[PDB]
A paper describes a structure:
Among the six secretion systems identified in Gram negative bacteria, the recently identified Type VI secretion system (T6SS) is composed of 13 core components which form a trans-envelope apparatus. We reported here the crystal structure of the TssJ lipoprotein, a critical core-component of Type VI secretion systems, and its interaction with TssM. TssJ is a β-sandwich resembling transthyretin with two additional elements: a protruding loop and a small helical domain.
The structure was solved from 2.0 Å resolution SIRAS (single isomorphous replacement with anomalous scattering) maps calculated using CsI as phasing agents, and the resolution limit was extended to 1.35 Å with the native data set. The segment 1-22 anchoring the protein to the membrane via Cys1 and its phospholipid thioester as well as the last four residues were not ordered in the crystal. TssJ has the topology of a β-sandwich formed by two four-stranded β-sheets. The other face of β-sheet 2 one is covered in part by three short helices (h1-3) occurring between β-strands 2 and 3. Noteworthy, TssJ helical domain (residues 57-71) is absent in transthyretin, 5-hydroxy-isourate hydrolase and ExsB, but a single helix is located on the same face, between strands 4 and 5 of transthyretin. The extended loop (residues 38-45) between stands 1 and 2, forming a protruding extension, is also absent in the three proteins. A group of aromatic residues, Tyr65, Phe113 and Trp123 form also a structurally important hydrophobic cluster stabilizing the α-helical domain against the β-sandwich core. Coupled to the observation that TssJ-ΔL1-2 was correctly folded, we concluded that the L1-2 loop of TssJ is a critical determinant for the TssJ-TssM interaction. Collectively, the data from the in vivo and in vitro experiments demonstrate the existence of a 1∶1 stoichiometry complex between the C-terminal periplasmic domain of TssM and the TssJ lipoprotein, with a Kd of 2-4 µM.
Numbering used by the authors: 22 to 151
Amino acid sequence: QIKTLHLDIRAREAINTSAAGIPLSVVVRIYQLKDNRSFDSADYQALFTGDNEILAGDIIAQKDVWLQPGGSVAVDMPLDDAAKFTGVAAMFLEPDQKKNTWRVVLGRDELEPDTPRLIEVSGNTLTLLP
């Protein structure tokens, strides 16, 4: 059904701001995952700097993209048939760990074969949008 993962990652002008309020580019990591449990349970430190081998076992493919303030990145990546979930996590300076707004996860049934899912980056948050 879905051969290709299509994402459109778009940044507002003010994203990932420093303490002085200056917008900064951000790395966004895209993960093709066999399962979601390890990814969803990982905290920011664990996901980005940790040695979780269960998480490593779940990751089929990963891409790191660099999103400029006011910019956009198109992801058009072969979707592995074993990728039941796609995780998208931003390496924000200031992630809101309490609200868990620094990452999103999509099941296969949330993707479209020939249309991208739009992910908005605004401040220190990611939001899936129509």
